[PDB]
Amino acid sequence: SVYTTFMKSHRCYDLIPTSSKLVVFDTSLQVKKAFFALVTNGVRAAPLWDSKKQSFVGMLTITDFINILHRYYKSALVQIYELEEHKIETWREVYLQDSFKPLVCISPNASLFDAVSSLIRNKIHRLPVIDPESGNTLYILTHKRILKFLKLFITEFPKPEFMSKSLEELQIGTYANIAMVRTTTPVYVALGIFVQHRVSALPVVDEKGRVVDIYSKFDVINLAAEKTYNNLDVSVTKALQHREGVLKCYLHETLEAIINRLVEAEVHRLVVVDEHDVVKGIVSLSDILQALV
Amino acid sequence: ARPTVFRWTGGGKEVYLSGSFNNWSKLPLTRDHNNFVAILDLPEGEHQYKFFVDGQWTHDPSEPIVTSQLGTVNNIIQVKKTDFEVFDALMVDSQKCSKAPPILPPHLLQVILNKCDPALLPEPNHVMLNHLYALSIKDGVMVLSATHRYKKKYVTTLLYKPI
Amino acid sequence: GRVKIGHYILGDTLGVGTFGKVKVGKHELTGHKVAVKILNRQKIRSLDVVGKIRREIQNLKLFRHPHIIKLYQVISTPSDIFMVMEYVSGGELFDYICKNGRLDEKESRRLFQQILSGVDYCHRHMVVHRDLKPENVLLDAHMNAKIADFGLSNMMSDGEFLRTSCGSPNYAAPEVISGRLYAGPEVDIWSSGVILYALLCGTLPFDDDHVPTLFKKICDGIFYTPQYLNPSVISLLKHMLQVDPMKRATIKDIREHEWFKQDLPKYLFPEAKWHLGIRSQSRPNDIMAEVCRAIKQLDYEWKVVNPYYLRVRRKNPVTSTFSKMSLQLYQVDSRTYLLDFRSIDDERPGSHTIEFFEMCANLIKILAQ
Ligand SMILES: Nc1ncnc2c1ncn2[C@@H]1O[C@H](COP(=O)(O)OP(=O)(O)O)[C@@H](O)[C@H]1O
Ligand SMILES: COc1nc(N(C)C)ccc1-c1cc2c(C(=O)O)c[nH]c2cc1Cl
Ligand SMILES: Nc1ncnc2c1ncn2[C@@H]1O[C@H](COP(=O)(O)O)[C@@H](O)[C@H]1O
Ligand SMILES: Nc1ncnc2c1ncn2[C@@H]1O[C@H](COP(=O)(O)O)[C@@H](O)[C@H]1O
Ligand SMILES: [Cl-]
Ligand SMILES: [Cl-]
Ligand SMILES: [Cl-]
């Protein structure tokens, strides 16, 4: 492999932007205020500071909101008291009660290969970069940032044998038992699929097998933004009304073009669609990085 | 050997330096404006010198002296190893050396948080780094912010802490 | 009968700088000329300028720009310190502007570009050369500008300001003559602005025999623009010589200016309300009395430097790591006063940045505004 040796050379520090923002929440902070802060500041994830332990215990992402929302929603007629009045540490001790997963972090001096491996190894999307000397969190590294950096090198350096090869011939990503929703499907049900299947996005399908829209974990953040989280009975299509044409890829298309299509549109995954505009599979940013490492 | 300066602060027509280092032979000092000098190198150790100022043998009283058993008052110089290396000599010199409120600079009033990606921020002025900024306590929770530089990149950290 | 240091024969005195005498030095064999700054160790310790020289040597050694005098070697003797630097035949730029008239738009620009290039190199190296005048700009045989005398120059530390009111009154910025706290580069821009005027006019923009009216004239930022002056350069001078440092030009703003860019050679240049701390409206001594009664209440060791500047330390209950932060009381207005919180970088642990926020949050919760 040629791309694997490139990742092992470049350090995490080279991916950190010239000047950035970093939101850190205290574990004692009210969880509802924590999600509203993710929205207001415009960040998808934040490291969690335990004032008593004096260390970064974890990360607060949309998955936490998806989990609280599904685990504690009763109806639109009654408020989610548990979300309204709960600290971050209180819910973290409930969620990670049986399965206790510690903080997954990378050093800026550590190679990008190690960072890409650490993401798949722990099955996560957000990896915080922490300096060993200071102990401070510097930047939260994602698949999209690595893919944007890798695509800059792929276009300059000569294209390998699989770049000109088809997506079907190489077999990259999940193609069997695809987790999907319908137009009539409510948000609570959709949130439930996100919980058990542990996937980033659910393709919204019409009366027929053809895919009309895509409901991502990011679209859940809108409920916190619009202060509309208390009504999860609403359909997926109704929730997506707040905002574009749907992006899809075919099984006969080349891997180099598929990589280019994702980074140009700035999306986490593309839908593997057949001739009759119906869902056949899926290809995530995590999958492309897996084959390349 | 290390070069040593012998300067004569005081008048005269003819000034000579005589020392243990040159077997007490009279060495003429050059005059610029009014002062007389000689830069000659000496081995690291003890050296005794004297001056011959216009037919008179004298010692510089500002410089350290040593009186002989025979009653010979000569100037002394202890050329140390530290006297040859610049940063060693400046280190030993530092060791040898033993209201109204300031008006707020307008630079500190300039922020990178108030003045596209929400995570991406403008490069801050070196002077506003490590300074603590805060937000008015709303909903009983305090928000703190500061910009710190790691290597050649800047990191503005926001802390949501309840009070 | 030759006075020799290194391998050069010391000659005539070129002048007397900030802390020392400067002499010519012709090589024993090659005849190569150098400028030797002679600093008497006993004299440079009489003034507590020992640290100032240590820094100046450190900086000038690392530097290598075509319009900044190169420091070749430093020779130490038991009595004095000899600073061997490059020699330039052309002498002072000030003297050029005196003996000959004012420079033409073309030559004025040429030399201004070269000076600003060097002024930029200094700032890019966190070194601010205060005392930037045509007396300190030297010229070579081929009319090239060369920045000299870094005696009054100081470092640009992260988070810290400068106070010293150093340099000639005519070239000094309004904040310098007012003795107010400055960042650093903005005062060199003002100095570079007056140098520019001096080149184009042959005279000073701010000058009077009466010192009080001169200081008023500087703080009023008013200067005469002669009819022969190009309105484009007048706009540059107006932006450069701004009384307000926030309204003043940056090396970037100058690089972008139309008059500067003209015939500029390639070799010269490369390439939701937030508040700072708390605002207690009490008496300046009464605020300092409240913070000391609050620092000790939170069990923290401190050392008072100024009646308004304090350095505090606190031991971590878990990692046992000691973290430091500085407090400074500024005057916003005649009615309101503000307290500033600044982090102090130390020398595996917890997190330096978050630990600093924890400290401040404690003292803010028990303070005014
Ligand atoms: N570095 C980390 N340390 C601890 N927990 C983490 C870390 N990164 C993610 N998590 C947890 O992993 C779970 C799933 O997160 P993730 O896949 O990254 O979601 P998202 O795609 O919205 O960013 C969450 O419960 C989150 O708290
Ligand atoms: C008379 O002194 C000199 N004469 C020289 N000639 C070429 C005749 C050269 C150098 C000096 C000199 C001057 C000073 C000094 C001063 O002049 O204040 C202080 N420390 C000095 C050390 C030396 Cl070697
Ligand atoms: N809708 C989906 N159904 C099934 N698997 C999916 C779906 N979306 C993503 N995946 C898979 O989930 C894994 C992690 O991807 P992701 O969480 O989408 O970044 C990859 O192996 C994807 O192929
Ligand atoms: N295949 C896709 N085609 C079009 N939009 C998509 C696709 N996948 C996700 N999105 C949109 O991307 C946004 C979420 O972004 P993210 O999960 O960060 O990539 C939502 O607005 C989704 O509707
Ligand atoms: Cl002089
Ligand atoms: Cl020359
Ligand atoms: Cl003049």
**Could you please report the per-residue DSSP string of B60-118?**
-TTS-EEE-TT--EEEEEE--STTTSHHHHHHHHHHH---PPPBPPGGGG--SS----S
Q: Which residues contact A181 (CB under 8 A, 6 or more apart)?
A: A189, A190, A193, A202, A203, A204, A205, A215, A236
| Alpha-carbon gap, residue C310 to C277, rounded angstroms | 15
User: CB–CB of B155 and A17 under 8 A?
Assistant: no
Say if residue C141 is in the same domain as residue C80: no
| Alpha-carbon gap, residue A61 to A35, rounded angstroms | 8
| Alpha-carbon gap, residue C194 to C197, rounded angstroms | 5
Say if residue C246 is in the same domain as residue C120: yes
Place of tokens 């350095």: C311
Query: How far is C-alpha C209 from the geometric centre of its chain's CA atoms?
Result: 27
* Token representation of residue B82: 């530290």
Cα of C70 from ligand 2 centre, angstroms: 22
| Alpha-carbon gap, residue C61 to C69, rounded angstroms | 11
Residue B162 touches partner A, C-beta closer than 8 Å: yes
Cα-based angle C78, C84, C85 (whole degrees, multiple of 5): 155
Partner residue facing C352 (CB), from A51, A56, A134: A134
Q: Which residues contact B148 (CB under 8 A, 6 or more apart)?
A: A136, B129, B130, B154, B155, B157, C343, C352, C353
Q: Which residues contact B43 (CB under 8 A, 6 or more apart)?
A: B1, B79
Chain C partners within 8 Å of B84 (Cβ): 76
3 state SS for chain A: CCHHHHHCCCEHHHHCCCEEEEEEEECCCEHHHHHHHHHHHCCCCEEEEECCCCEEEEEECHHHHHHHHHHHCCECCECCHHHHCCEHHHHHHHHCCCCCCCCCCECCCCEHHHHHHHHHHCCCCCEEEECCCCCCEEEEECHHHHHHHHHHHHCCCCCCCCCCCEHHHHCCCCCCCCCCEECCCEHHHHHHHHHHHCCCEEEEECCCCEEEEEEEHHHHHHHHHCCCCCCCCCEHHHHHHHCCCCCEECCCCEHHHHHHHHHHHCCCEEEEECCCCEEEEEEEHHHHHHHCC
| Alpha-carbon gap, residue C292 to C295, rounded angstroms | 5
Cα-based angle A15, A16, A19 (whole degrees, multiple of 5): 145
Say if residue C75 is in the same domain as residue C105: no
Place of tokens 């929730």: A239
| Alpha-carbon gap, residue B60 to B51, rounded angstroms | 8
Dihedral, CA of residue A233, residue A177, residue A125 and residue A5, to nearest 10: -170
Chain C partners within 8 Å of A47 (Cβ): none
Give kind and range of the element (H or E) at residue C10: strand C8-16
Q: What is the DSSP letter of B120?
A: B
Residue B27 touches partner C, C-beta closer than 8 Å: no
Say if residue C75 is in the same domain as residue C103: no
Cα of C33 from ligand 6 centre, angstroms: 9
Coil vs helix vs strand at C121: helix
Place of tokens 């989280």: A229
Contact A255, A162 (CB under 8 A): yes
Encoded amino acid at C317, one letter: P
Contact A107, A129 (CB under 8 A): yes
Does residue B7 line the site of ligand 2, with CB under 6 A?
A: yes
A64 is in an annotated binding site: yes
List the single best residue of C273, C274, C348, C353 to mutate versus A (max A Cβ within 10 A): C353
User: CB–CB of A24 and B160 under 8 A?
Assistant: yes
Rounded to 10°, the helix C185-201/C231-240 angle is: 150
Contact A88, A25 (CB under 8 A): yes
Coil vs helix vs strand at C153: coil
Contact C290, C367 (CB under 8 A): yes
| Alpha-carbon gap, residue A260 to C233, rounded angstroms | 49
Contact B2, B83 (CB under 8 A): yes
CATH code assigned at C257: 1.10.510.10
Resolution of the structure in the document, Å: 3.5
Partner residue facing C161 (CB), from B4, B101, B105: B105
C20 is in an annotated binding site: yes
- The subunits that touch chain A, with at least 3 C-beta pairs less than 8 Å apart, are B, C
Q: In terms of residue numbers, what domain contains C163?
A: 93-261
Centre a 10 Å sphere on the Cβ of residue A214 and count the other Cβ atoms it contains.
Answer: 23
CATH architecture of B1-97: Sandwich (2.60)
Helix%, strand%, coil% for chain B, nearest 5: 15, 40, 45
Give the determination technique: X-ray
Contact A4, A113 (CB under 8 A): yes
Partner residue facing A19 (CB), from B124, B157, B161: B124
Encoded amino acid at A165, one letter: K
Contact A31, A5 (CB under 8 A): no
Query: How far is C-alpha C303 from the geometric centre of its chain's CA atoms?
Result: 28
* Token representation of residue B96: 């040898």
Chain B partners within 8 Å of A21 (Cβ): 118-121, 156, 158
Say if residue C104 is in the same domain as residue C56: no
> Rounded to a whole number, what is the distance in Å from the CA of B36 to chain A's nearest CA?
56
Q: Which residues contact A244 (CB under 8 A, 6 or more apart)?
A: none
- The subunits that touch chain B, with at least 3 C-beta pairs less than 8 Å apart, are A, C
Q: Which ligand is nearest to the CA of A119?
A: 1
> Rounded to a whole number, what is the distance in Å from the CA of C51 to chain B's nearest CA?
8
